[PDB]
């Protein structure tokens, strides 16, 4: 399951402690990380993202609406079941890209609705 | 004045052609000082006979080719550059190689004039296609070092005259390195490793002593000035 | 294979040693115990199954012994 | 090393013995148990 | 040096085998070329050139007139003897134009031959093999602190 | 000399090294001519420690002042007025080097100026009030000692200043072949050199002491520090640069200090340098030396 | 191997030698042996070399980031008080010779020495155990040394022609040993285009099938067209390896050494790289690479380019002075005007530099440096950031070659310091992350 | 529990451990480091450290 | 095409301390290797003619001053480094220097024993005043190269002896150059040898060759 040892170039040996090696392989370049160590730390610590971005709750076409200062996204499920609404999306975050999401685009169960960092707990 | 202890000269034999030589210990920094002069004395200074110019029958204004042989003009010249024969003439002598019919020519088919002796008969020269003949003249003059092909005057009047790069000296490759001894009786002393690949004319030991003498007497020009100051033996 | 000639610690080559044991870790205990075994003899008791070098260190010996397949081992 | 014998087997680090003592002084009862026989004494 | 360039002494060679100028004048320090370009300390190369100027002296540039570069302008600086000391205050120092003009100047070692060109380079002979180094190398005098 | 003149934000009555953020470490526009921006520690003291600038001067109330030359109607006077940071935000500071005209006045059509932003601007000679006393007002003493400073990135310059104060006195103490202004005045103001306080002539010169007979009829003598151990173990040895008959003037330099030669700071030697890479010996910042 | 200061070695091994010189009768009892080592009586040195032989030691440099920050070597007694470190392990240790120090540790028990020789030995750890890429691979000096070796120069001395009419080809050599005799004389250039017969090297794949295909060239002779250096380069690779015949960038060197690890034992790669080192240095010095105010070139188009955007700036600034322009847009515009010009000067600069210049060769070969770096040296350093983190619309028009100005310099440090402060807290946080990953 | 204590929030850890009356099996490698045991990884794994070595009877013959 | 006109080495004169030397002809690509082979040996192995230790009555070590002397003992040792001496040797021999009253001390003031000489008496040692008195003996040994001061804990010396670094190098500065001899080109090299006046460029080059000749063997 682990696969080849990057050092030997062959199947990993049975003694190898790959956790420590993973820890070091990840942290060593951290000095070169200038969207950086804060984002990395954000991921490994599983905190809710800096600017939360919503993910599709279900599959269906998307109805886009622009309020004043906000965005409204509604997913009409292919069920077709209960419509699913995403209430106030600050226009500062814009939207994710396929190009940029537009009214009528289809969406699968996991897709990211807006540029940002999806809450890992939510996914 | 000077006494020091102690240098010695030993040799590891890699092949009948090749030998490695090492001198231990030197006094720092004498490795760099002499070693580069030795690579030169063996390479450029040793008397030996080599081919100078050649002309083939049937090649005059043609660029490269020889009907009846798979080897072309260029391939045969460098094929011939490897010919090793010690000549006693001191003046250019023309040997002759003439052969016909299907067959493979070798350095044994060439008839040396009296005083020139070919040291590598098995040497391959050309492959003769079915029903073919080859005629070649070879100019062999003594010399030293490596003298690139000379067009002087230049090749000039002679039509079909091909000057060739002449490897005059027996030793075709040499290199040196420097390492340090010792166990701290002598700490960081220099050890010189010299790598000599030789042609069958002379052995490595012969080419070393030849360099030794040509270099020793060479420096006699300076020692004759006084002889007062000296060193250890 | 021509790798030229290994000097000191690099002789014998790991690769030729790793064919005599399951892993690099096994190779360590393999040679390591044989070395403690040799040193005892100079005072288990057996070996130097190979011809010792002049001053050769027991660990260096045990590695040569392993290279020549002069000993077998059983993993735990 | 001075007798050229084999290097012996290691013992317990003194710092660890100290740690047990410092935890005891906090009213933490720290026992080192074997598979059994239960409590081992550092001494 | 004063520019932030630092390093340990990795080796010290017999004065016999060192890059040495046509005079037979050995160089004291050999600094690696690679550390220089990426560190933005290039001032250390300037003072290496000026260092050679100040050590060997120089002349104008006159007559008939004063050249275009000296016009902005070195004053009474037109000539300095060998070994004279120079001062380039930080934010008004010598200027690139003025360096080149000085870089050609002045012989001799003793004999009238010149040891450095208008590029601040010279042909060094390896004191090890005795043969020259294939390309012209930058030489000069640098101020280095212990 | 830089240890005095150091100003640090740590200590009792000030912030701790750990708590203060990078806003205090950044250089402010008002540091100009007061606190040298190019000089601080590389460690995690960066920006908390700095050295007072060359022409900077402290106010009886504790605010640093910088010298300026006031300009009136496109003409820079000889009036030199020391201004605090508050009164500098009040006016327009002309750039130190702007072309000078005959008896002096604005030559260049327009003037380089600093605003109260501080935000730089280009306006004609019309609106200026004060001008800079000279380049390197912002610079400190050690910084002002780097020849061709303007060509080196602030990163390597900082390292360069720090390492000058890291040098050690040599037995011989040769002065820099290519220098800057400060070497002369930084050595005398350091106090490690022997200066004469009255004009006169030398009565005696010994390795041990130097006496001068003043024109005043008074007799001054100076005992020489000889092989004195310094705080960190360097050598403070001094040597006389004068001879018996010599005439001398007030404020002149009688004897050299540890790092000085003939009155100017000598922190090192002038060496013949070759910038070629050499047989993998000087590599990765390593250096090779003549056994000479 | 590593250079170990003999004084340091003596103390490290003290109990070992104390025994040895009691075994040999140099000292009658252990007490005498101890004094003999302390006073450093000359007999001990020969003894030290005995005990230290094939007895490994661990070398560490702090901070230790990956396990490669500790490696075992074969100690060699060295004069002086410094430590001689092989130049190919700098990468792993991140070792600067600016005055870094390193710790030495002496493994004692048989198991510890085994772990050193087998697990931690220098030559058995080559590839990074993260990306698998090679680490001990040549770098810096060794790049430019080989890059120069393998490069091909149009119209160098001895260039094969090939001859026509009255002359034969003229670019041909009996053997590589001949092209050397020609190179030592002024005849041949190492970077020349000549073709040669090679008995002892191995041709490529395609040219292998067409020439032999029986078949192979174990002792056989064959001819290809390459630079003399490219020949000597391939004499460094294993005899079994095919003939590359390229000029070696760093990446090209990475390709090959990556390939040696897949197809060959480690010992082979260990020795191959050792030979790349020796060659790369010899030719890095013969490379003729230096730096000078002269070798720093500036594009002449910089002036016009500079004043070209000066108008666009003062005009867009003229549009803001008119009052219509949005202040944030005018400043923002100055960023795009100047940011763009910085590329043109980069484009213009790159276009100016002759390909053999010493400054560009360093960056081209991948040894060290950037173009962004060589853009601030000559041309323009470009826009710089205020401490607030924004972009100061005032560009630095001068380059560090012409020198910056009082205000140009005061502005640069504004940002340049904030970066050096970052580098401080980037190791403090990165290490705090690594400690959590590890746990 | 002693692995957690050495990591962070030592006081919080020790207090919860003493109340839960926690027993640490000393399986992990950090625990074995602290007490000076052989970490259960690499050469310290059972299969490797229990290796038994003897020369082949064929080898002893050649002596 | 053997060209044998045996090498010719003809002397020259430039100054009294240095003289050019020329050797022609030589096979192509020689003078460099042959020139540097002499320069390397000249800058090192020419014997001396150097001063080992010194003793000064008043001072027990290097780091003090002397009453009335302008130079401290260490700055005086530095000066005495520039001494260029020459000695028939063998075995160590002490020189002597004593000077009183004001003046300037120089190498001329050094009284050499029988069999040694000081070749630059013009050299400044120390400047003395009315109270200055300098009594110092110097030990001249014979050898070659550069030998760092031998500490008297290693030698048998007592607390009084000041060991000093010794430079035995008759030769001062050395260079060379070559000119080929067009086809048929040979090589002729000129070497420029300068000495410190302890020996003539002739005698040193003779030393080098003599030392260089004896070394080549086979
Ligand atoms: Mg460092």
Swiss-Prot record, chain B:
The enzyme's E.C. designation: 2.7.7.6
Record comment regarding domains: The N-terminal domain is essential for RNAP assembly and basal transcription, whereas the C-terminal domain is involved in interaction with transcriptional regulators and with upstream promoter elements.
Catalytic activity from the UniProt record: RNA(n) + a ribonucleoside 5'-triphosphate = RNA(n+1) + diphosphate
Region entry Alpha N-terminal domain (alpha-NTD), spans: 1-226
Keyword Transcription set for record: yes
Superkingdom: Bacteria
Parent sequence residues shown: 1 to 233 of 350
Any one of the GO CC terms: DNA-directed RNA polymerase complex
Function: DNA-dependent RNA polymerase catalyzes the transcription of DNA into RNA using the four ribonucleoside triphosphates as substrates.
UniProt entry tagged with the keyword Metal-binding: no
Quaternary structure and partners: Homodimer. The RNAP catalytic core consists of 2 alpha, 1 beta, 1 beta' and 1 omega subunit. When a sigma factor is associated with the core the holoenzyme is formed, which can initiate transcription.
GO MF term set: DNA binding; DNA-directed RNA polymerase activity; protein dimerization activity
GO annotation terms (biological process): DNA-templated transcription
Name by which UniProt lists this protein: DNA-directed RNA polymerase subunit alpha
Protein family per UniProt: Belongs to the RNA polymerase alpha chain family.
Swiss-Prot record, chain C:
Cysteines engaged in disulfide bonds, as pairs: none
Nucleotidyltransferase found in the keyword field: yes
GO BP terms: DNA-templated transcription
Lineage top rank: taxon: Bacteria
Catalyzed reaction equations: RNA(n) + a ribonucleoside 5'-triphosphate = RNA(n+1) + diphosphate
Any one Gene Ontology molecular-function term assigned to this protein's record: DNA binding
Keywords from the UniProt entry: DNA-directed RNA polymerase, Nucleotidyltransferase, Transcription, Transferase
Cellular component GO terms held in the UniProt record: DNA-directed RNA polymerase complex
Enzyme class: transferase
TM region(s), chain numbering: none
EC number(s) recorded for this UniProt protein: 2.7.7.6
Assembly: The RNAP catalytic core consists of 2 alpha, 1 beta, 1 beta' and 1 omega subunit. When a sigma factor is associated with the core the holoenzyme is formed, which can initiate transcription.
Family named by the database record: Belongs to the RNA polymerase subunit omega family.
Function: Promotes RNA polymerase assembly. Latches the N- and C-terminal regions of the beta' subunit thereby facilitating its interaction with the beta and alpha subunits.
Protein name: DNA-directed RNA polymerase subunit omega
Gene source species: Mycolicibacterium smegmatis (strain ATCC 700084 / mc(2)155) (Mycobacterium smegmatis)
Entire-sequence positions represented here: 24 to 106 of 107
Curated annotation (Swiss-Prot), chain E:
Signal peptide: none
Family: Belongs to the RNA polymerase beta chain family.
Subunit structure, as described in the record: The RNAP catalytic core consists of 2 alpha, 1 beta, 1 beta' and 1 omega subunit. When a sigma factor is associated with the core the holoenzyme is formed, which can initiate transcription. Interacts with RbpA, which partially restores Rif-inhibited transcription.
Note: Mutations in the RRDR sequence (residues 423-449) confer rifampicin (Rif) resistance. Rif blocks transcription initiation but not elongation.
Function: DNA-dependent RNA polymerase catalyzes the transcription of DNA into RNA using the four ribonucleoside triphosphates as substrates. This subunit often mutates to generate rifampicin (Rif) resistance. Interaction with RbpA partially restores Rif-inhibited transcription; once the subunit is Rif-resistant however RbpA no longer stimulates transcription.
UniProt name for this protein: DNA-directed RNA polymerase subunit beta
Annotated organism of origin: Mycolicibacterium smegmatis (strain ATCC 700084 / mc(2)155) (Mycobacterium smegmatis)
Source lineage: Bacteria, Bacillati, Actinomycetota, Actinomycetes, Mycobacteriales
Name of the gene this protein is made from: rpoB
UniProtKB/Swiss-Prot annotation, chain H:
Top-level taxonomy: Bacteria, Bacillati, Actinomycetota, Actinomycetes, Mycobacteriales
Name of the encoding gene: rpoC
Superkingdom of source: Bacteria
Disulfide cross-links: none
Portion of the full-length sequence here: 1221 to 1283 of 1317
Organism: Mycolicibacterium smegmatis (strain ATCC 700084 / mc(2)155) (Mycobacterium smegmatis)
Function statement: DNA-dependent RNA polymerase catalyzes the transcription of DNA into RNA using the four ribonucleoside triphosphates as substrates.
Entry similarity comment: Belongs to the RNA polymerase beta' chain family.
Subunit-structure text: The RNAP catalytic core consists of 2 alpha, 1 beta, 1 beta' and 1 omega subunit. When a sigma factor is associated with the core the holoenzyme is formed, which can initiate transcription.
Cleaved signal peptide residues: none
Name the UniProt record assigns to this protein: DNA-directed RNA polymerase subunit beta'
């Amino acid at each position: 399951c682990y696969g080849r040892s990057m050092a030997t170039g062959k199947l990993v040996d049975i003694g190898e402690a790959v956790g420590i090696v993973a820890a070091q392989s990840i942290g060593e370049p951290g000095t070169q990380l200038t969207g950086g160590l804060p984002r990395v730390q954000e991921l490994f610590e599983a905190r809710v993202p800096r600017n939360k971005a919503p993910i599709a709750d279900v599959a269906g076409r998307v109805r886009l609406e622009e309020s004043d200062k906000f965005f409204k996204i509604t997913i009409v499920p292919d069920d077709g079941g209960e419509e699913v609404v995403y209430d106030k999306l600050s226009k500062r975050q814009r939207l994710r890209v396929i190009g940029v999401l537009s009214d009528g685009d289809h969406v699968e169960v996991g897709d990211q609705l807006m540029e940002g960092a999806a809450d890992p707990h939510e996914v | 004045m000077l006494i020091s202890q102690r240098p010695t000269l030993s040799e590891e034999t890699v092949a009948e052609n090749r030998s490695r030589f090492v001198i231990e210990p030197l006094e720092p920094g004498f490795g760099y000082t002499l070693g580069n002069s030795l690579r030169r004395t063996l390479l450029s200074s040793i008397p030996g006979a080599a081919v100078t110019s050649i002309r083939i029958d049937g090649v005059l204004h043609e660029f490269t080719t020889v009907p009846g042989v798979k080897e072309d003009v260029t391939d045969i010249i460098l094929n011939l550059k490897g010919l090793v024969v010690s000549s006693d003439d001191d003046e250019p002598v023309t040997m002759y190689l003439r052969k016909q019919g299907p067959g493979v020519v070798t350095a044994g088919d060439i008839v040396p004039p009296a005083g020139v002796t070919v040291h590598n008969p098995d040497m391959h020269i050309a492959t003769l296609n079915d029903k073919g003949k080859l005629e070649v003249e070879l100019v062999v003059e003594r010399g030293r070092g490596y003298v690139p092909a000379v067009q002087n005057k230049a090749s000039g009047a002679e039509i079909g005259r091909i000057p060739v790069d002449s490897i005059y000296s027996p030793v075709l490759k040499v290199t040196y390195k420097v390492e340090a001894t010792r166990v701290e009786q002598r700490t960081d002393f220099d050890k010189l490793i010299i790598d000599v690949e030789t042609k069958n004319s002379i052995s490595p030991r012969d080419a070393l002593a030849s360099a030794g003498g040509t270099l020793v007497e060479l420096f006699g020009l300076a020692r004759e000035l006084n002889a007062d100051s000296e060193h250890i033996e | 294979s021509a790798y030229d000639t290994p000097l000191g610690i690099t002789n014998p080559p790991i690769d030729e040693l790793l064919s005599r044991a399951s892993s690099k870790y096994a190779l360590v205990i393999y040679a390591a115990k044989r070395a403690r075994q040799i040193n005892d003899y100079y005072n288990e008791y057996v070996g130097p199954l190979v011809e010792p070098g002049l001053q050769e260190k027991p660990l260096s010996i045990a590695l040569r012994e392993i290279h020549g397949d002069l000993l077998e081992h059983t993993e735990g | 090393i001075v007798k050229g014998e084999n290097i012996p087997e290691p013992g317990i680090p003194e710092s660890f013995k100290v740690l047990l003592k410092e935890l005891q002084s906090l009213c933490l009862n720290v026992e080192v148990l074997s598979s059994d026989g239960a409590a081992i004494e550092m001494r | 040096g004063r520019h932030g360039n630092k390093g340990v002494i990795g080796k010290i060679l017999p004065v016999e085998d060192m890059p040495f100028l046509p005079d037979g004048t050995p160089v004291d320090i050999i600094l690696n070329t690679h550390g220089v370009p990426r560190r933005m300390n290039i001032g250390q190369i300037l003072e290496t050139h000026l260092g050679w100027v100040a050590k060997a002296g120089w002349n104008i540039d006159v007559a008939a007139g004063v050249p275009d570069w000296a016009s902005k302008l070195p004053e009474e600086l037109y000539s300095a003897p060998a070994d004279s000391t120079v001062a380039t205050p930080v934010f008004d120092g010598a200027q690139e134009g003025e360096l080149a003009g000085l870089l050609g100047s002045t012989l001799p070692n003793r004999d009238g031959e010149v040891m450095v060109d208008a590029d601040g380079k010279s042909t060094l002979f390896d004191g090890r093999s005795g043969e020259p180094f294939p390309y012209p190398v930058t030489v000069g005098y640098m101020y280095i602190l212990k | 000399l830089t240890h005095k003149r150091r100003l640090s934000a740590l200590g009792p009555g000030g912030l701790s090294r750990e708590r203060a953020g990078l806003e205090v470490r950044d250089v402010h526009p008002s540091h100009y001519g007061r606190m040298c921006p190019i000089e601080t520690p590389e460690g995690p003291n960066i920006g908390l420690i700095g050295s007072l600038s060359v022409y900077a001067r402290v106010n009886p109330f504790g605010f640093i002042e910088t010298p300026y030359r006031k300009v009136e109607n496109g003409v820079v006077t000889d009036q030199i007025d020391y201004l605090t940071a508050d009164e500098e935000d009040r006016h327009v500071v002309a750039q130190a080097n702007s072309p000078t005209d005959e008896n002096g006045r604005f030559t260049e059509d327009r003037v380089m100026v600093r605003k109260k932003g501080g935000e730089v601007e280009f306006v004609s000679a019309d609106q200026v009030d004060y001008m800079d006393v000279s380049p390197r007002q912002m610079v400190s003493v050690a910084t002002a000692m780097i020849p061709f400073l303007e060509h080196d990135d602030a990163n390597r310059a900082l390292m360069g200043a720090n390492m000058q104060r890291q040098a050690v006195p040599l037995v011989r103490s040769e002065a820099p072949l290519v220098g800057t202004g400060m070497e002369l005045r930084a050595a005398i103001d350091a106090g490690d050199v022997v200066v004469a306080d009255k004009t006169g002539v030398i009565e005696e010169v010994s390795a041990d002491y130097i006496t001068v007979m003043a024109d005043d009829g008074t007799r001054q003598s100076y005992r020489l520090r000889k092989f004195a151990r310094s705080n960190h173990g360097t050598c403070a040895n001094q040597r006389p640069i004068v001879d018996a008959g010599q005439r001398v003037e007030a404020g002149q330099v009688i004897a050299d200090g540890p790092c000085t030669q003939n009155g100017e700071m000598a922190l090192g030697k002038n060496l013949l340098v070759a910038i070629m890479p050499w047989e993998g010996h000087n590599y990765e910042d390593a250096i090779i030396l003549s056994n000479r | 191997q590593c250079g170990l200061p003999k004084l340091m070695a003596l103390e490290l091994f003290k109990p070992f030698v104390m025994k040895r010189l009691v075994d040999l009768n140099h000292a009658q009892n252990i007490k005498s042996a101890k004094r003999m080592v302390e006073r450093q009586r000359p007999q001990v040195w020969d003894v030290l070399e005995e005990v230290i032989a094939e007895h490994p030691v661990l070398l560490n440099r702090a901070p230790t980031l990956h396990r490669l920050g500790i490696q075992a070597f074969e100690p060699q007694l060295v004069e002086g008080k410094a430590i001689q470190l092989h130049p190919l392990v700098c990468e792993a240790f991140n070792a600067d010779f600016d005055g870094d120090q390193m710790a030495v540790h002496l493994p004692l028990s048989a198991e510890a020495q085994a772990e050193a020789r087998i697990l931690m030995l220098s030559s058995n750890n080559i590839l990074s155990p993260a990306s698998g890429k090679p680490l001990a691979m040549p770098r810096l000096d060794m790049v430019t040394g080989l890059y120069y070796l393998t490069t091909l120069v149009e119209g160098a001395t001895g260039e094969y022609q090939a001859a026509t009419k009255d002359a034969p080809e003229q670019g041909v050599y009996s053997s590589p040993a001949e092209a050397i005799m020609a190179m030592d004389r002024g005849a041949l250039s190492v970077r020349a285009k000549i073709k040669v017969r090679l008995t002892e090297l191995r041709p490529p794949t395609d040219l292998e099938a067409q020439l032999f295909e029986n078949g192979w060239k174990p002792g056989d002779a064959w001819t290809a067209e390459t630079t003399l250096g490219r020949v000597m380069f391939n004499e460094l690779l294993p005899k079994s390896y095919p003939f590359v015949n390229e000029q070696m960038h760093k990446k090209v060197q990475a390709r090959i050494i990556n390939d040696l690890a897949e197809r060959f034992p480690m010992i082979v790669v260990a020795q191959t790289v050792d030979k790349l080192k020796d060659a790369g240095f010899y030719w890095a010095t013969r490379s003729g690479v230096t730096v000078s105010m002269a070798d720093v070139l500036v594009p002449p188009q910089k002036q016009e380019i500079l004043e070209r955007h000066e108008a666009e700036a003062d005009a867009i600034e003229r549009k803001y002075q008119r009052g219509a322009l949005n202040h944030t847009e005018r400043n923002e515009s100055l960023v795009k005007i100047w940011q763009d010009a910085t590329e043109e000067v980069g484009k213009a600069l790159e276009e100016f530099y002759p390909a053999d210049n010493p400054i560009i060769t360093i960056v081209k070969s991948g040894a060290t440096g950037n173009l962004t770096q060589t853009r601030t040296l000559a041309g323009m350093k470009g826009l710089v950031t205020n401490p607030k983190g924004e972009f100061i619309p005032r560009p630095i028009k001068s380059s560090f070659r012409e020198g910056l100005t009082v205000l140009e310099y005061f502005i640069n440090t504004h940002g340049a310091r904030k970066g050096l402060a970052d580098t401080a807290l980037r190791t403090a946080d990165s290490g705090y992350l690594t400690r959590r990953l590890v746990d | 529990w002693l692995s957690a204590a050495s990591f962070q929030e030592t006081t919080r850890v020790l207090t919860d451990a003493a109340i839960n009356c926690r027993s640490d099996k000393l399986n992990g490698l950090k625990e074995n480091v602290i007490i000076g045991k052989l970490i259960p990884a690499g050469t310290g794994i059972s299969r490797y450290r229990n290796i038994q070595v003897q020369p082949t009877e064929e080898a002893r013959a050649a002596a």
